[PDB]
Design a protein around this ligand. Sequence first.
Ligand SMILES: [Fe+2]
Ligand SMILES: [Fe+2]
Ligand SMILES: [Fe+2]
Ligand SMILES: [Fe+2]
Lengths: 296, 296
Amino acid sequence: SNEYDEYIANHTDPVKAINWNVIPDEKDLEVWDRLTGNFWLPEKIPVSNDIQSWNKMTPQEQLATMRVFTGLTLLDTIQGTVGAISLLPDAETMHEEAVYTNIAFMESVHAKSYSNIFMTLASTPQINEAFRWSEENENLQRKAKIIMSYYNGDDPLKKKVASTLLESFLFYSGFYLPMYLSSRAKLTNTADIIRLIIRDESVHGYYIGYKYQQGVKKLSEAEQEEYKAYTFDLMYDLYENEIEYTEDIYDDLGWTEDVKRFLRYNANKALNNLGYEGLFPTDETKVSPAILSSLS
Amino acid sequence: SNEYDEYIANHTDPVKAINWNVIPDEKDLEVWDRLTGNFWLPEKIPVSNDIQSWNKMTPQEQLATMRVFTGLTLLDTIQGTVGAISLLPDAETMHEEAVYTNIAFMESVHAKSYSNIFMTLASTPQINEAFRWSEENENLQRKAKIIMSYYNGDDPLKKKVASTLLESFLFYSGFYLPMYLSSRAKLTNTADIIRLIIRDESVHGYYIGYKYQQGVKKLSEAEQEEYKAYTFDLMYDLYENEIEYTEDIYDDLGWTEDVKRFLRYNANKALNNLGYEGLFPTDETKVSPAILSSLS
Ligand SMILES: [Fe+2]
Ligand SMILES: [Fe+2]
Ligand SMILES: [Fe+2]
Ligand SMILES: [Fe+2]
């Protein structure tokens, strides 16, 4: 009766309802239609049909799979409950805000898909060991916290840089495994879910990077130089950290070198999304065309 | 000394990945399944087929629809970009946080649904005036600001109360009009959209209220008393304001008395969702049968 009057007193401006009849930035409407139009749930994909394929896999291939997937789940959990949410208050338009609520939900759908996969293919002990592994792995925990430090920070442009690097780069040391297996005719239904997730992250990376460029372009030439420096600096730390994560997951299988090349291919794309030139020369980013197609 | 080194130090516990194979509260899973299974976009309803009945509506009706829809749009905007989101930090389980991301998203689909109807039926001037009206109407800004003072406060249980009252009560002065009109062959397709929204909001109110009940039952005897008192005081202020708002929308139509009963009817349901008895005696909540049958 009186308790909420101080707030009313300090918020004289009117609260505004979103109006989709007037779109200040056409891109928002484009991404909204694209993202909502691409709605999906893991229950729709017959993961159960990958069982025979999953059982023929070696113990090594299964362990690697459990880990990269648990690592992907961690990233989506963060992005969905902390990342996207951290971008709302810094939006330029109300329709941009609507998009972020769609990104947060889809991230939760991505995270849930991995459990659908586990619960269909893995044993409870395997699942339990994987989540335990993700709680204790230093590289995984380190990339999670570095990203969360920015979301919990107070710089809006830096939140968008971390988000874009998480979306267009950090997931890839993990996306390599299912894409490759898919190219060898293994876990193809599981790959279908992965392709749906990539179709989403691709657009999230591009969109958030777009808002970053719009925001940073409003600063002086000199300030723009410091954000670029900060972006590359963050990429150096994330890349370094991701190289180790990758070695530990893929050394046994012996795929490490191909994953590193894929890491560099995607780092260039993440930087491009942020409006910057790539970091690695093209001849250092060779990816198999069988992996690139099944990617698309 | 990295920009993030401090954060990594202020948060020693591991970042956890959501695990859907282990569920503390089965209700979280039930609601996630019900809400995601009930997914829809306003595009799926042929609102264009309502242009005939729309034009057959009196100037007072069209005007009332415009303002009521603008008031609903405003509520979902707050709920989608601030309400559901403010609930995340206090969730008891990670699965609950996942549910809140679906709510925030669906609240945006709700806000957009109205714009869809407007663009299909109204003229740009009717639309601009409606939004101008909702920004200047003191009773609408009042409930919007009371609700937001709580979402922006630091009391988690108050956020859930405020959210449940908005979900199971504040929308209804508005849902009344589309329900009355379709029982009279007016705006029938538009009413299908309203039913889809009500189907989401009644689950939202039930769920958030359920979480409130668990949170509050973990408090001492005196605190449980105080939250119950606070819920009834707020419920009364909201109702008080809603009467004035209802009057300003329906008097020219002369439906006010029936709408007031509908308000009391849902007020009781809102308190029930928070685990308390209704505020109004049953004989004071007798809404016309046409309206309730129209909800069916
Ligand atoms: Fe994702
Ligand atoms: Fe994403
Ligand atoms: Fe809503
Ligand atoms: Fe709702």
